[PDB]
Each structure stands twice: as C-alpha cells, then as structure tokens.
C-alpha cells in the first residue's frame, strides 16, 4: 500500500513514477490498450487526488470514465477539423 508518507521523501518526478506503477495495473485491467495513455492523463492531477483513487475503486473507475470521454472528445474534435 502506497501512502502520502512514502511519497513525501521522493522528488516530484519519482512521486509521479511511484503513483503510476500502482495505478497502471488497475487501469490496464479496465482498458488494456489505453492504460498507458489514461495513466499519463491521471498523473497530471494533484498527488492527493491520486492517493484517494488508489484507496477508492469507485473514484478511480469514474476518473477513468472521464479520461475515456476526454479521449473520445479529442478524436471527435480532430474529425470535425478534418471534415
């Protein structure tokens, strides 16, 4: 289990790496092809929010739904621009 205190002694890029290694396998179980992209999108948010999502499966699942909708929106935006 990854805690605020384990993150606190690491430099910020290492903190994002440690959160990433815990989130990636959960996100990969949901969306194997998008797991790298969705993990990257979630790592941009506040570390406190990321620790909450590792403790609350319902919060993580909703945030992954937000990431999937955001990717769909971006694909639609690009299709609108090309048409």
């Amino acid at each position: 289990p990854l805690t605020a205190s384990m993150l606190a002694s690491a430099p910020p890029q290492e903190q994002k790496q440690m959160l990433g290694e815990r989130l990636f396998p959960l996100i990969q179980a949901m969306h194997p092809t998008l797991a790298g992209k969705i993990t990257g999108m979630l790592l941009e948010i506040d570390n406190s929010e990321l620790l909450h999502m590792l403790e609350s499966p319902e919060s993580l699942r909703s945030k992954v739904d937000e990431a999937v909708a955001v990717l769909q929106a971006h694909q639609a935006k690009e299709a609108a621009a090309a048409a």
Binding site: G20, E21, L23, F24, P25, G36, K37, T39, G40, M41, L42, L43, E44, I45, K63, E66, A67, V70, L71, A73, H74
Partner: peptide, 12 residues
Amino acid sequence: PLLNPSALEFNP
C-alpha cells in the same frame, strides 16, 4: 477543468 487529452503516456 477536464483531463488533458494531450498528456504524455506513462510507461511502467
């Protein structure tokens, strides 16, 4: 606002 669709991929 919403998540960033241009975020860099995480590679584990």
